[PDB]
From Swiss-Prot, chain A:
Family membership noted in the UniProt record: Belongs to the complex I 75 kDa subunit family.
Protein purpose: Core subunit of the mitochondrial membrane respiratory chain NADH dehydrogenase (Complex I) which catalyzes electron transfer from NADH through the respiratory chain, using ubiquinone as an electron acceptor. Essential for catalysing the entry and efficient transfer of electrons within complex I. Plays a key role in the assembly and stability of complex I and participates in the association of complex I with ubiquinol-cytochrome reductase complex (Complex III) to form supercomplexes.
Binding, [4Fe-4S] cluster 1: H96, C100, C103, C109
The encoding gene: NDUFS1
Protein name: NADH-ubiquinone oxidoreductase 75 kDa subunit, mitochondrial
Subunit (UniProt): Core subunit of respiratory chain NADH dehydrogenase (Complex I) which is composed of 45 different subunits. This is the largest subunit of complex I and it is a component of the iron-sulfur (IP) fragment of the enzyme. Complex I associates with ubiquinol-cytochrome reductase complex (Complex III) to form supercomplexes. Interacts with MDM2 and AKAP1.
Record-annotated 4Fe-4S Mo/W bis-MGD-type domain positions: 217-263
Binding residues for [4Fe-4S] cluster 2: C148, C151, C154, C198
Cell location: Mitochondrion inner membrane
Curated annotation (Swiss-Prot), chain B:
Membership in a protein family: Belongs to the complex I NDUFV3 subunit family.
Role: Accessory subunit of the mitochondrial membrane respiratory chain NADH dehydrogenase (Complex I), that is believed not to be involved in catalysis. Complex I functions in the transfer of electrons from NADH to the respiratory chain. The immediate electron acceptor for the enzyme is believed to be ubiquinone. May be the terminally assembled subunit of Complex I.
Name of this chain's protein: NADH dehydrogenase [ubiquinone] flavoprotein 3, mitochondrial
Compartments (UniProt record): Mitochondrion inner membrane
Range within the parent protein: 65 to 109 of 109
GO BP: any one term: mitochondrial ATP synthesis coupled electron transport
One Gene Ontology CC term in the entry: mitochondrion
Modified residues (Phosphoserine): S42
Organism: Bos taurus (Bovine)
Protein encoded by which gene: NDUFV3
Alphabetic keyword roster: Electron transport, Membrane, Mitochondrion, Mitochondrion inner membrane, Phosphoprotein, Respiratory chain, Transit peptide, Transport
Subunit structure: Complex I is composed of 45 different subunits. This is a component of the flavoprotein-sulfur (FP) fragment of the enzyme.
Curated annotation (Swiss-Prot), chain C:
Name this protein carries in UniProt: NADH dehydrogenase [ubiquinone] flavoprotein 1, mitochondrial
Source lineage: Eukaryota, Metazoa, Chordata, Craniata, Vertebrata
Positions bearing N6-acetyllysine: K55, K78, K349
Membrane topology: Peripheral membrane protein
Entry EC no(s): 7.1.1.2
Signal sequence region: none
Swiss-Prot record, chain D:
Phosphotyrosine: modified positions: Y158
Family: Belongs to the complex I 24 kDa subunit family.
Alphabetic keyword roster: 2Fe-2S, Acetylation, Electron transport, Iron, Iron-sulfur, Membrane, Metal-binding, Mitochondrion, Mitochondrion inner membrane, NAD, Oxidoreductase, Phosphoprotein, Respiratory chain, Transit peptide, Translocase, Transport, Ubiquinone
Species annotation: Bos taurus
A UniProt-annotated Pfam family: 2Fe-2S_thioredx
PANTHER family assigned: NADH DEHYDROGENASE [UBIQUINONE] FLAVOPROTEIN 2, MITOCHONDRIAL, NADH DEHYDROGENASE UBIQUINONE FLAVOPROTEIN 2, MITOCHONDRIAL
Gene Ontology cellular component list: mitochondrial inner membrane; mitochondrion; respiratory chain complex I
Name of the gene: NDUFV2
Highest taxon in the source lineage: Eukaryota
Primary location recorded for the protein, binned into one broad class: mitochondrion
Species lineage: Eukaryota, Metazoa, Chordata, Craniata, Vertebrata
Swiss-Prot/TrEMBL GO biological process terms: mitochondrial electron transport, NADH to ubiquinone
Chain segments carrying region Disordered: 178-214
Self-association and partners: Core subunit of respiratory chain NADH dehydrogenase (Complex I) which is composed of 45 different subunits. This is a component of the flavoprotein-sulfur (FP) fragment of the enzyme.
Entry protein name: NADH dehydrogenase [ubiquinone] flavoprotein 2, mitochondrial
Record's cofactor remark: Binds 1 [2Fe-2S] cluster.
């Protein structure tokens, strides 16, 4: 075969040419941190949370973007790798606001969970924080953009999945912002799906705002009946009351998306 | 013809208007060779 | 016997013989100084021979990185696969303290346009885009005039120089961004997107501008290319030390008696270069405080090192700095060193593209810290904090702008820590 | 200041009248041909520059016009307008003065140049005069570092300025003249101020140094 052999912490694994470092680690049950990499979108490589050390190399490479070369010993838990995650996670939380109590994402937030698994336990940031103004993009997706971590998942989803080149980045530097630049409503049959991909509380469901917390909801894997596609969904209840609807991944039907009517 | 090293020979840029660069690019069109074709009118096609 | 002292470059060696614009810069003027001479005969020797001359001459990229130019341009030297191949010239002169590039297009435009043809034929390219920064409107027009003259003289276009090789040259102006000097971010602007660098791989020699193979070269490393072929690569290598050979343009600026751009030889001593051409340090050489050798992306060095350091890549690397763009910025005793470097950080903070995390959220963090150091509104325990913050940016970024913004801070903390701590004491006791 | 989100106003809104003059359209017809077919989006920067020259700034209507003629999503033109800094999204004075203030131009006392310009016009940085003749802003390195201190007005570099030298140009501009570009110190270009030190010899003729093999 054309399979190449590479080592993940010394463990041999066979991969096809052009496989990325991040995909190599999945083959052996290892999951690299990530904020910008989504398996169903473009590759952005602009969060640097997936930086990984390659043995006998002086630099740490972006696992999500870097294709793997033959006989690379990937060190997913070396000291250099650990200090790359700690450094990056320190920059994300520098200007992030203290909204966890009043943030809808709280309890199911990738910034929160990966902070406690890969980041430090305190902060050495003494300066003031950046503050961005909200942007109205419709009656479904609420925007509180001070929490955006400029990952571009929303930008890449709308352009490629929903085919609506209406979201983008404006400015540059620490002031770079994500939005429409004008009073525009992101109204598409797949509009609600940007809520899920957004790893933080910048985008959240507006109808669902403030009603429940992730840990107190019971999940029921059911089917959608709003159309003939039969999208797999997870119905969330709390005290016998339906609270929200989430996609349930199925490769052959709906990938991991659902339409606004279902959602 | 005599060599004089005490005078500035770059004196044409004191009177460039606001469309000089574009006009020169326009004038350099008939000389250009035909461009290659990607095969589609745009990546959105 | 190879020499051990460098400098005193004889004018018959200086490649840029119209550096100061004291002679006609048009085609007739250029053709009276060896430009566009036997250019055809160079082309018909083949791409390998042209690269062999550059490869043997020991040339290194003059844009700041300093990689070997012969090896780089050899990546293009592979048979096509159904796509164009392009040579992109980086004239986005935006590095602070650097003005050498502005003096080549404006005064020796034809020498560059001769380089494109020589370089383009070497790489097998079909046309050259020249990226000239937006603020250089007048310089771009001069370059445009030269291109038209060459087009009407048969020196480019269809059947260039009579050699049967077609080669077009286009000049595209940037709309204003220091980051657009980066080789990949420069490619994005040509494509019409924002100027945000790409990750690597792929390298531009695989997927460059418009997705076709592309080589990005600085104006200086491309202007001298025809002369290397004409005068032989052996002649070029004779200057500078081994693996540092050639002549370099230098911009001496700041606290010097006579700031100037002068062409000299590689490995020239810094003290000799300043005193010989720049008229010495203002107030006498003992007034020297620090020097930034290669523009601003390189760490500064204190006076004690400036008295014996040669101007080349390896010697400056041995001094915990880098040759960079060879743009010497001099600072004297009257200079407030903290504020002077606190301003460089405030430059990168504005020029940061913002795409990736460390430089987007971290260069602003360093900028906010350095502002407090200027007033002394800090404590000594934060100096090591800023050192550690800088090393989290360096090497963790998409492009080198993040690397180039950490190094200025490290230099200041490395060689001038007492001034930082001295400043904080005064603020502490005053506000008491 | 300098927000990055557009809001509709009576004088700046998508119904504002803008259109390239037919002479500009001919120029655009040649800009688009510098790029391969199917990659016509590469003309966004030059076309946005051309519109700014016609109008002096970019209203929201101008950006949409560039998008319409190049078949580009409107948001992809708003990204470019806010990214590069030479695109003026708010009206500017008749003369946009831009005082460099980076370290090389700071070491040579640009602050005095900046202070002098404010005093002559009585406007703070970033402001425009009541008559809409001048707009003053600080900028980063402009590439004329050896000729510091210096400013740029519209398209020209005035170099080696001193507080008296700059105030002359403003007076010349306020009279409707076209002040000469280039340094105002006694030198012409990047050459040393105190007499040359290199190239003080006639340039060698064609064929000098050509190796025998070639
Ligand atoms: C932030 C940044 C700014 C840069 N600006 C320039 C520039 O203005 N001119 C230049 O020739 N190279 C510049 N470079 C270096 C280019 O990326 C690239 O290394 C070089 O232009 C390639 O040509 P070379 O072979 O001569 O090095 C810059 C790099 C960075 C990271
Ligand atoms: S996005 Fe996550 S980390 Fe930020 S406030 Fe919300 S829950 Fe907390
Ligand atoms: S809004 Fe959310 S998905 Fe979009 S860039 Fe910001 S963090 Fe990423
Ligand atoms: S280091 Fe800064 S300038 Fe370079 S790609 Fe990252 S954010 Fe952009
Ligand atoms: S997940 Fe790789 S850089 Fe974002
Ligand atoms: S520092 Fe002002 S022009 Fe370079
Ligand atoms: K979310």
């Amino acid at each position: 075969s054309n399979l190449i052999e590479v080592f993940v912490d010394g463990q041999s694994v066979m991969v096809e040419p052009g496989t990325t470092v991040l995909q190599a680690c999945e083959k052996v049950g290892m999951q690299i941190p990530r904020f910008c990499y989504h398996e169903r979108l473009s590759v952005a490589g602009n969060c640097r949370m997936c930086l990984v050390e390659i043995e006998k190399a002086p630099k740490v490479v972006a696992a999500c973007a870097m294709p793997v070369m033959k006989g690379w010993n990937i060190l997913t838990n070396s000291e250099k790798t650990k200090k790359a995650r700690e450094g990056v996670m320190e920059f994300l939380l520098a200007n992030h606001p203290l909204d966890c109590p009043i943030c809808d994402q709280g309890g199911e937030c990738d910034l929160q969970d990966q902070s406690m698994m890969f980041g430090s336990d305190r902060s050495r940031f003494l300066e003031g924080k950046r503050a961005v103004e909200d942007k109205n993009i419709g009656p479904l997706v609420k925007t509180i953009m001070t929490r955006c971590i400029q990952c571009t998942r929303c930008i890449r989803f709308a352009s490629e999945i929903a085919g609506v080149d209406d979201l983008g980045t404006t400015g540059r530097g620490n002031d770079m912002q994500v939005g429409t630049y004008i009073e525009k409503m992101f109204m598409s049959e797949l509009s609600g799906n940007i809520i899920d991909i957004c790893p933080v509380g910048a985008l959240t469901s507006k109808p669902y705002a403030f009603t429940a917390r992730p840990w107190e909801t019971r999940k029921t894997e059911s089917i959608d009946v709003m159309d003939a596609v039969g999208s797999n969904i997870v119905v969330s209840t709390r005290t016998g009351e339906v609270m929200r609807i989430l996609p349930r991944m199925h490769e052959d039907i709906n990938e991991e998306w659902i339409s606004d009517k279902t959602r | 013809e005599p060599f004089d090293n005490t005078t500035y020979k770059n004196l044409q840029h004191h009177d460039y208007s606001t469309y000089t660069f574009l006009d020169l690019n326009l004038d350099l069109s008939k000389f250009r060779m035909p461009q290659p074709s990607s095969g589609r009118e745009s990546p959105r096609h | 016997p190879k020499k051990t002292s460098f400098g005193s470059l004889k004018d018959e060696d200086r490649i840029f013989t119209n550096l100061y614009g004291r002679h006609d810069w048009r085609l007739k003027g250029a053709q009276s100084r060896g430009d566009w001479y036997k250019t055809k005969e160079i082309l018909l020797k083949g791409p390998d021979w042209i690269l062999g001359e550059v490869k043997t001459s020991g040339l290194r990229g003059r844009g700041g990185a300093g990689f070997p130019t012969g090896l780089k341009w050899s990546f293009m030297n592979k048979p096509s696969d159904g796509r164009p191949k392009y040579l992109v010239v980086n004239a986005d002169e935006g590095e602070p303290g650097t003005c050498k590039d502005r003096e080549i297009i404006r005064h020796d435009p034809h020498k560059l346009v001769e380089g494109c043809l020589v370089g383009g034929r070497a790489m097998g390219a079909r046309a050259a885009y020249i990226y000239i920064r937006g603020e250089f409107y007048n310089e771009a027009s001069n370059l445009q005039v030269a291109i038209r003259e060459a087009y009407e003289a048969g020196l480019i276009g269809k059947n260039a120089c009579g050699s049967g090789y077609d080669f077009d040259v286009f000049v595209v102006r940037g709309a204003g961004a220091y980051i657009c000097g980066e080789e990949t971010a420069l490619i994005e602007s040509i494509e019409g997107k924002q100027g945000k660098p790409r990750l690597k791989p792929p390298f531009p020699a695989d997927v460059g501008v418009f997705g076709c193979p592309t080589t990005v070269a600085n104006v200086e490393t491309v202007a001298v290319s025809p002369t290397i072929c004409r005068r032989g690569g052996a002649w070029f290598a004779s200057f500078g030390r081994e693996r540092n050979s050639g002549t370099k343009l230098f911009n001496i600026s700041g606290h010097v008696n006579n700031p100037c751009t002068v062409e000299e030889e590689m490995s020239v001593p810094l003290k000799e270069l300043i005193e010989k051409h720049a008229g010495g340090v203002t107030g006498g050489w003992d007034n020297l405080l620090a020097v930034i050798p290669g523009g601003s992306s390189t760490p500064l060095i204190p006076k004690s090192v400036c008295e014996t350091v040669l101007m080349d890549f390896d010697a400056l690397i041995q001094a915990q700095t880098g040759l960079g763009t060879a743009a010497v910025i001099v600072m004297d005793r009257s200079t407030d060193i903290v504020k002077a470097i606190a301003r460089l950080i405030e430059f990168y903070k504005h020029e940061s593209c913002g795409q990736c995390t460390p430089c987007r959220e971290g260069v602003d963090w360093m900028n906010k810290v350095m502002a407090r150091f200027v007033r002394g509104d800090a404590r000594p325990a934060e100096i090591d904090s800023l050192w550690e913050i800088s090393k989290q940016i360096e090497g963790h970024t998409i492009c080198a702008l993040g690397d180039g913004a950490a190094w200025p801070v490290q230099g200041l903390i490395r060689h001038f820590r007492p001034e930082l701590e001295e400043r904080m004491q005064q603020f502490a006791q005053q506000h008491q | 200041g300098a927000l990055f989100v557009h809001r509709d106003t009576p004088e700046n809104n998508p119904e504002t009248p803008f259109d390239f003059t037919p002479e500009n359209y001919k120029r655009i017809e040649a800009i688009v041909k510098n790029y391969p077919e199917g990659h016509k989006a590469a003309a966004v920067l030059p076309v946005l520059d051309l519109a700014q020259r016609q109008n002096g700034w970019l209203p929201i209507s101008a950006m949409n016009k560039v998008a319409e003629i190049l078949q580009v999503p409107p948001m992809r033109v708003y990204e470019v307008a806010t990214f590069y800094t030479m695109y003026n999204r708010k009206p500017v004075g008749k003369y946009h003065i831009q005082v460099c203030t980076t370290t090389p131009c700071m070491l040579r006392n640009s602050d005095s140049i900046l202070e002098a310009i404010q005093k002559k016009l009585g406007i703070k940085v970033g402001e425009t005069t009541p008559d809409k003749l001048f707009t003053l802003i600080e900028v980063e390195c402009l590439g004329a570092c050896v000729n510091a201190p210096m400013v740029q007005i519209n398209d020209n570099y005035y170099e080696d300025l001193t507080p008296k030298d700059i105030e002359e140009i403003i007076d010349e501009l306020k009279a409707g003249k076209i002040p000469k570009p280039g340094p105002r110190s006694g030198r012409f270009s990047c050459e040393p101020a105190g007499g040359l030190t290199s190239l003080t010899e006639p340039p060698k003729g064609p064929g000098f140094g050509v190796q025998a093999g070639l």
